[PDB]
Amino acid sequence: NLPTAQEVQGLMARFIELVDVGDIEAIVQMFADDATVEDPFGQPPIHGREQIAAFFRQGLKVRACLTGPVRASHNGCGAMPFRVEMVWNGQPCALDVIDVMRFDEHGRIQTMQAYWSEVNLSV
Amino acid sequence: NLPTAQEVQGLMARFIELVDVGDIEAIVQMFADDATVEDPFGQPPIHGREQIAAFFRQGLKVRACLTGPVRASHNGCGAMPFRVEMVWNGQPCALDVIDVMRFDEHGRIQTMQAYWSEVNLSV
Numbered sequence: 001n002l003p004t005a006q007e008v009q010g011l012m013a014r015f016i017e018l019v020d021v022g023d024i025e026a027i028v029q030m031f032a033d034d035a036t037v038e039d040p041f042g043q044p045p046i047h048g049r050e051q052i053a054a055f056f057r058q059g060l061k062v063r064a065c066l067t068g069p070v071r072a073s074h075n076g077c078g079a080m081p082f083r084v085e086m087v088w089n090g091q092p093c094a095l096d097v098i099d100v101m102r103f104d105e106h107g108r109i110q111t112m113q114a115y116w117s118e119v120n121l122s123v
Numbered sequence: 124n125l126p127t128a129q130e131v132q133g134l135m136a137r138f139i140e141l142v143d144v145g146d147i148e149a150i151v152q153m154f155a156d157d158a159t160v161e162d163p164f165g166q167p168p169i170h171g172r173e174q175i176a177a178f179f180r181q182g183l184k185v186r187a188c189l190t191g192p193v194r195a196s197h198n199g200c201g202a203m204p205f206r207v208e209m210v211w212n213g214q215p216c217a218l219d220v221i222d223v224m225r226f227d228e229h230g231r232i233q234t235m236q237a238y239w240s241e242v243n244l245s246v
Contacts, residue, residue, distance in 0.1 A: 005240040042198040068191055068204045071221040071238035075165040079221040079238040081191045081204040098194040098202040100223060115194035115202040117128040
C-alpha cells in the first residue's frame with residue numbers, strides 16, 4: 001500500500017543498497033512499469049522500465065552511500081542525500097546528489113527526481 | 124535573473140544563515156510576494172508573504188545548519204539537507220529536514236517544500 005513514513009525510509013535506503021552493489025534487475029523492479037525518471041532534474045524525463053533499465057545499465061566500479069537520513073512524509077514521498085563515487089576516464093570523481101521519490105499504492109517508485117549539476121561534482 | 128546553479132547554492136546557504144540567526148524580516152524578503160510554502164510536505168500550503176511571515180515568527184532559541192552541500196540544477200531549482208535544533212517544552216530536540224526550492228527570474232523563492240515527518244525527529 002501507500003508506504004508509511006517508516007516504509008519510505010526503508011525503501012529508499014534499499015534503493016542506494018542496490019545502486020551500490022550494481023544489481024540492475026533488482027533496481028529496475030523497484031520502479032512502477034510506467035515510472036518516469038528525471039536525472040539530473042532539468043533534463044527531459046525517461047519513462048517506463050525499458051528506458052530506465054537502459055539508463056541504469058549505462059551508468060552503473062561505482063559505489064553509493066546515504067550521507068544523511070532519509071526524510072519521509074506521510075503522503076508516499078521521501079527525499080534523501082547521498083554521494084556517488086565513480087572514476088571518470090581513469091580519473092576518479094564524486095557527485096553529491098539528492099533524490100526525491102514518490103511511491104505508488106504498491107510501494108513502487110512512481111516518479112524520481114535527482115538534484116545535482118556540475119557544482120556538486122568533484123573530479 | 125533565473126539564478127545559475129552557482130547562485131542557487133549561494134541563495135540557499137544564505138537561507139539557512141537567516142533561519143539560524145532568526146532574522147524574520149530578512150527571511151521573509153527572500154520570498155516572492157505570492158510564494159507558497161509546504162512545510163511539512165503533505166500539508167496544505169501557505170501562500171504569500173503575510174502568511175509566511177506568520178509561519179516563520181511562530182516557529183523561530185533555534186539553530187539551523189547545512190549538513191551537506193546544496194544540490195542545484197540549471198533550471199532555478201535546488202535541494203539541500205539540514206538540521207534544526209530546538210528545545211521542545213524544556214526538552215531539546217532535533218529535526219533532519221530536506222528543503223527543495225524553486226526560484227523565480229528575480230532570484231526569489233517562488234515555492235518551497237520541506238520533507239520531514241516524526242521519523243526525522245529526535246527529542
